[PDB]
Amino acid sequence: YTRVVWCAVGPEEQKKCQQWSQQSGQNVTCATASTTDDCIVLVLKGEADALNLDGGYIYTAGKCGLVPVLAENRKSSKHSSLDCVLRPTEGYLAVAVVKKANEGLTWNSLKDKKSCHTAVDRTAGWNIPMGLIVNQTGSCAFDEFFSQSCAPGADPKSRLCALCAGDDQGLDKCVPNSKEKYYGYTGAFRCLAEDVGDVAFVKNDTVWENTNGESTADWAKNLKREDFRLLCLDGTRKPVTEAQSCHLAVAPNHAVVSRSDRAAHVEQVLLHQQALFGKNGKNCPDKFCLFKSETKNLLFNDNTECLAKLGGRPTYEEYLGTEYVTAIANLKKCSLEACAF
Numbered sequence: 001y002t003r004v005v006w007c008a009v010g011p012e013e014q015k016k017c018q019q020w021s022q023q024s025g026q027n028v029t030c031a032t033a034s035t036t037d038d039c040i041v042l043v044l045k046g047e048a049d050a051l052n053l054d055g056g057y058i059y060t061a062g063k064c065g066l067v068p069v070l071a072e073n074r075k076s077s078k079h080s081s082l083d084c085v086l087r088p089t090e091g092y093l094a095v096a097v098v099k100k101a102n103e104g105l106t107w108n109s110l111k112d113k114k115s116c117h118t119a120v121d122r123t124a125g126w127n128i129p130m131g132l133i134v135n136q137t138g139s140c141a142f143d144e145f146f147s148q149s150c151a152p153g154a155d156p157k158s159r160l161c162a163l164c165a166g167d168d169q170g171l172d173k174c175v176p177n178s179k180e181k182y183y184g185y186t187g188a189f190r191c192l193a194e195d196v197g198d199v200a201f202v203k204n205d206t207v208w209e210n211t212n213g214e215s216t217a218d219w220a221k222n223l224k225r226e227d228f229r230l231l232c233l234d235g236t237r238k239p240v241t242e243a244q245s246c247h248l249a250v251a252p253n254h255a256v257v258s259r260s261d262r263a264a265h266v267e268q269v270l271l272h273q274q275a276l277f278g279k280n281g282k283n284c285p286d287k288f289c290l291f292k293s294e295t296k297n298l299l300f301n302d303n304t305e306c307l308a309k310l311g312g313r314p315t316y317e318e319y320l321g322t323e324y325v326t327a328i329a330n331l332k333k334c335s336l337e338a339c340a341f
C-alpha cells in the first residue's frame, strides 16, 4: 500500500536492493530484470513502481507514459544555501577521454579506433557521441565507424561487442547490466584504463572518481589524472581540469521514473527513504547508505548528494530539454511516433 517496488537491473543491483528492502522494514521491495528496457516493461505492467534512469532511457520510458519523479542532485558550489532537495539540478558533462600517451589522437582521427561506451541508448556513452558522429559523417552506419567497441546492448556478434569481456567466467558478454565488466561509467572508463579501447565516452565525474587514489579498486589504484586527456570538438586535447571548455554536451541528470498514476506515492516514500539512508540520514553511515556501493553506481550514482524535487512539474520532454530530445530523435531515425514495447 505505502509500499514501493523498486526494479533492479542485474544481480548486484538486486543484492543492494534486498539490503535496502530489509533495512526499510519492507516499505521498499525489489523486482529484478536483466535489462533496463525489461525494468521499464515491469513498470508499465504495474509489477514494479520505479527505478532511476539515465536520460536516454527517460526518453524511452517517456514515450511509454512514464514520468520523471525526482532527480539525482550532486554537490555544487552554487545554490549552496538552498537545501539539496529543493536545489535545481545542474546536469553533467559528457566527455570523450583518451590516454595522454596516445599522442595525436583527436576528435578528427577517431575513425577506425577502438571505443568504450557505457551502453547503447545512454546519454554520454551513446546518444551524444554517436549523434555527433552521424551528423559529421552524414551517414547512419555508426556500426562501421570504430574498428571495435564495447557497447553493452549491441549484438554480441558485431564489432560493437568485440571488446566487451562479460563476467568472472566470460558469460554475459555485452549484456547491458553490471555483470558486463565494461558496463556503465565505471566499466567504460576501465575499458580505456586497461587499454582495451582508445576512447571512453563517459561523464566528467567518472575520470575524477577513478584517479589519484579516489577508488582503491585494483585496476584504478594507480591511475593518475595527468595520464588522461579530454577530446574537444575543435580538434584539440585538454587536461581533465578543463571539462567546462572541452565537453561534448551537458546531460540532464539521472532521474527516478514511474507510471504517472504512481508518481505521488513513489515521491512520498522516496523522500522518507532518503531522510533515513541518504547522505546525512539517520541510518546511513550506521545501518545502510542508499548512495554508496563502492564505485559501482548501483541503483543510484555514488556521487549523489540527494534526490531533488523537480519544479515546473515537467513532462519527460521538458525534463530532458528540446536540445537533447531533438538530438535523440535525429539519431533514432537511423535505427514513427510510438512506445517501443
Ligand SMILES: *[C@@H]1O[C@H](CO)[C@@H](O[C@@H]2O[C@H](CO)[C@@H](O)[C@H](O)[C@H]2NC(C)=O)[C@H](O)[C@H]1NC(C)=O
Pocket: 002, 023, 024, 025, 027, 276
Ligand atoms: C514504513 O512506512 C511507515 C508508513 O509510512 C512509517 O511509519 C511512519 O513513520 C513516521 C516517522 O518515520 C511516523 O511519524 C508515522 O507515525 C508513521 N506513519 C504511518 C502512516 O504509520 C515507517 O516509519 C516506515 N518504516 C521504515 C523503516 O522506513
Ligand SMILES: *[C@@H]1O[C@H](CO)[C@@H](O[C@@H]2O[C@H](CO)[C@@H](O)[C@H](O)[C@H]2NC(C)=O)[C@H](O)[C@H]1NC(C)=O
Pocket: 075, 076, 077, 093, 204, 205, 206, 208, 209, 214, 243, 244, 303
Ligand atoms: C568534474 O567532476 C569532478 C568530480 O565530481 C568535480 O570536482 C568536484 O567538485 C566539488 C565542488 O563542486 C568538490 O567539492 C569535490 O571535491 C570535487 N571532486 C573530486 C573528487 O575532486 C569537478 O567540479 C567537475 N568539473 C566540472 C567543470 O564540472
Ligand SMILES: *[C@@H]1O[C@H](CO)[C@@H](O[C@@H]2O[C@H](CO)[C@@H](O)[C@H](O)[C@H]2NC(C)=O)[C@H](O)[C@H]1NC(C)=O
Pocket: 127, 128, 131, 132, 135, 322, 323, 326, 327, 330
Ligand atoms: C544532428 O543534426 C540535426 C539536424 O540539424 C540536429 O537537429 C537540429 O538541432 C537544432 C538545435 O537543437 C535545432 O534548432 C533544429 O531544429 C534541429 N533540426 C532538426 C532536423 O530537428 C541535431 O541536434 C544534431 N545532433 C547533435 C547530437 O548535435
Ligand SMILES: Cc1ccc(-c2ncc(Cl)cc2-c2ccc(S(C)(=O)=O)cc2)cn1
Pocket: 089, 090, 091, 250, 252, 253, 317, 318, 319, 320, 321, 322, 323
Ligand atoms: C535540468 C534541466 C532543466 C531544464 C532543461 C531544459 N528544458 C527545456 C529546454 Cl528547451 C532546454 C533546457 C536546457 C538545455 C541546456 C541547458 S544548459 C545551458 O546546457 O545548461 C539548460 C537548459 C534541461 N535540464
Ligand SMILES: [Fe+3]
Pocket: 054, 055, 122, 123, 124, 251, 254
Ligand atoms: Fe548518464
Ligand SMILES: [Zn+2]
Pocket: 247, 249, 250
Ligand atoms: Zn557546453
Ligand SMILES: [Zn+2]
Pocket: 312, 313, 314, 315, 318
Ligand atoms: Zn510544463
